């Protein structure tokens, strides 16, 4: 292996060795002491405890994560990031780091719990962890951290995706988890103004409930957000049929009707005038 042929974009010096037997991997709960400089000026001082791959939402250069993913237990060192592996072109305000800049990072990796890989865990474990993760996805969400919530609910769809050595009991326990995941994803996306993704998640979910109140609903909100009135009308009109006493379904269904007839009226008068104009133009003989 020994990938690292990012041509020294990411380089570290083991200031202080430190026991260690294994390294932090994808999605691992890392506890770390951070010190990063530009030119030689300090912009970041703090001891963050985050999940690897979560760094983007925590003002940390892409490169800094792959570096950490190559440390010991209580190891110390420093990372020198070439422009392409740290805020790069977009630079980074609130730290005012001009585009195409380099960085210096002095990081001390304390503890860390590696993220179990799909292969490592048997049927039940996947279900347990699928739970542990969702719990988090839940917190991050009610906390307004939608992107990080995404990170969580996804791990679930991942782990449970292939593996099917599930007893009929776990088969549906896991299916519930999946459905839950997809519904929650759609929820985040809508928050994130990512309506295409919202709709793709509703579909993955309705492939599991095709009657689901939330999926059918959330998909109507997404169509409606991007002026997909007709498609929306369809989803709200259907949610009502399956759940008459559904609050927003009725109102939203109304919005569609409104926007649709006004739309109709508009495009009607157009052809009307377009028609007239052709006539007069045709009369020219």
């Amino acid at each position: 292996g020994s990938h690292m042929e990012e041509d020294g974009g990411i380089i570290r010096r083991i200031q202080t060795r430190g026991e260690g037997y294994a390294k932090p991997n994808e999605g691992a709960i890392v506890e770390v002491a951070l010190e990063g400089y530009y030119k030689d000026k300090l912009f970041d001082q703090r001891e963050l405890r985050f999940e690897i791959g979560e760094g983007e939402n925590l003002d940390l250069p892409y490169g800094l994560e792959r570096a950490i993913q190559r440390m010991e237990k209580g190891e110390h060192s420093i990372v020198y990031l070439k422009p392409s592996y740290a805020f790069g072109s977009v630079g980074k305000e609130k730290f005012q780091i001009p585009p195409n800049a380099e960085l210096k990072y002095e990081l001390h990796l304390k503890s860390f719990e590696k993220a179990k890989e799909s292969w490592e865990m048997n049927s039940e474990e996947k279900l347990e962890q699928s739970t542990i993760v969702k719990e988090r996805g839940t917190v991050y969400f009610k906390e307004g951290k939608y992107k990080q919530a995404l990170l969580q609910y996804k791990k679930i769809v991942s782990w449970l995706e292939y593996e099917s050595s599930f007893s009929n009991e776990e088969a549906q326990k896991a299916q519930a988890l999946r459905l839950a995941s997809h519904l929650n994803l759609a929820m985040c996306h809508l928050k994130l103004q990512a309506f295409s993704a919202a709709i793709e998640s509703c579909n993955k979910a309705l492939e599991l409930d095709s009657n689901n109140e939330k999926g059918l609903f959330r998909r109507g909100e997404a169509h409606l957000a991007v002026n997909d009135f007709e498609l929306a009308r369809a989803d709200f009109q259907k949610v009502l049929q399956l759940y008459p006493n559904n609050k927003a379904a009725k109102t939203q269904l109304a919005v569609c009707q409104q926007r649709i007839r006004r739309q109709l009226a508009r495009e009607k008068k157009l052809y009307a005038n377009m028609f007239e104009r052709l006539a007069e133009e045709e009369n020219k003989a």
Partner: peptide, 5 residues
């Protein structure tokens, strides 16, 4: 749990 609405 999932609520809100």
């Amino acid at each position: 749990m999932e609520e809100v609405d």
